[PDB]
From Swiss-Prot:
It is found in: Secreted, Extracellular space. Its main location: secreted. The gene is PRSS1. Its EC number is 3.4.21.4. Its cofactor is Ca(2+). This is Serine protease 1.
Length: 223
């Protein structure tokens, strides 16, 4: 997150870190045994880390649970990042309390103007590299489809939306990928892509989760 703030320990209780020896992507806990992330975060050997604040220090609220199965969206295209979503099942159910909690799936899509909370352990600099140890947060609005398409001609599909600030300075970034965009208490987006980070007229591009609720539900029901 560039131009955000320190969230506060365990204030984003559905935020997970995906670890393969090191943090490499975010995710969102959507029930005791399943995480939603970005398909471009796919790899084998994932451990899901819940209850994290400082990802480099054991602080006492962590749960570390191996993935038993990963499911990349059937129509994921890695060249265009269309359908940039994947589900991860935990080998065991997480214990849910105030500091580790699921986030509700949307029943309807969000619209431009709605403010949302974006969170992660990604890069904090736009022209530089600094990775935080504690979870960072950014409040940002959803942008219009037309401004989104204007920023990124020929690249925005119906499974993507833009959020952030066209003036630059505030954005998600590398290492935030896969993590949440929560608006009015619903998971509306997944950190997916962007040209650099926090660049003028290059807002963040997010997977449009409301389009995938049917797929998420049926996948969970059968796996
Ligand atoms: Ca920790």
């Amino acid at each position: 997150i560039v131009g955000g703030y320190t969230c506060g320990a365990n204030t984003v209780p559905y935020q997970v870190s995906l670890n393969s020896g090191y943090h490499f992507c975010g995710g969102s806990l959507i029930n005791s045994q399943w995480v939603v992330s970005a398909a471009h975060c796919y790899k084998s050997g994932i451990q899901v880390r819940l209850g994290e604040d400082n990802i480099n220090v054991v602080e006492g609220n962590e749960q570390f649970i191996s993935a038993s199965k990963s499911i990349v969206h059937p129509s994921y295209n890695s060249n265009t990042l269309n359908n940039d979503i994947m589900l991860i099942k935990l080998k065991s159910a997480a214990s849910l309390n105030s500091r580790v909690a699921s986030i509700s799936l949307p029943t309807s899509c969000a619209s431009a103007g709605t403010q949302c909370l974006i969170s992660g352990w990604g890069n904090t600099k736009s022209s530089g590299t600094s990775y935080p140890d504690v979870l960072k947060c950014l409040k940002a609005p959803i942008l219009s489809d037309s401004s989104c398409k204007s920023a990124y001609p020929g690249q925005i599909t119906s499974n993507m939306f833009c959020a952030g600030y066209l003036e630059g300075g505030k954005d998600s970034c590398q290492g935030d990928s896969g993590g949440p965009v929560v608006c009015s208490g619903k998971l509306q987006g997944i950190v997916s892509w962007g040209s650099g980070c926090a660049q003028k007229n290059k807002p963040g591009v997010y997977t449009k989760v409301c389009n995938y609720v049917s797929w998420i539900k049926q996948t969970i029901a059968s796996n």
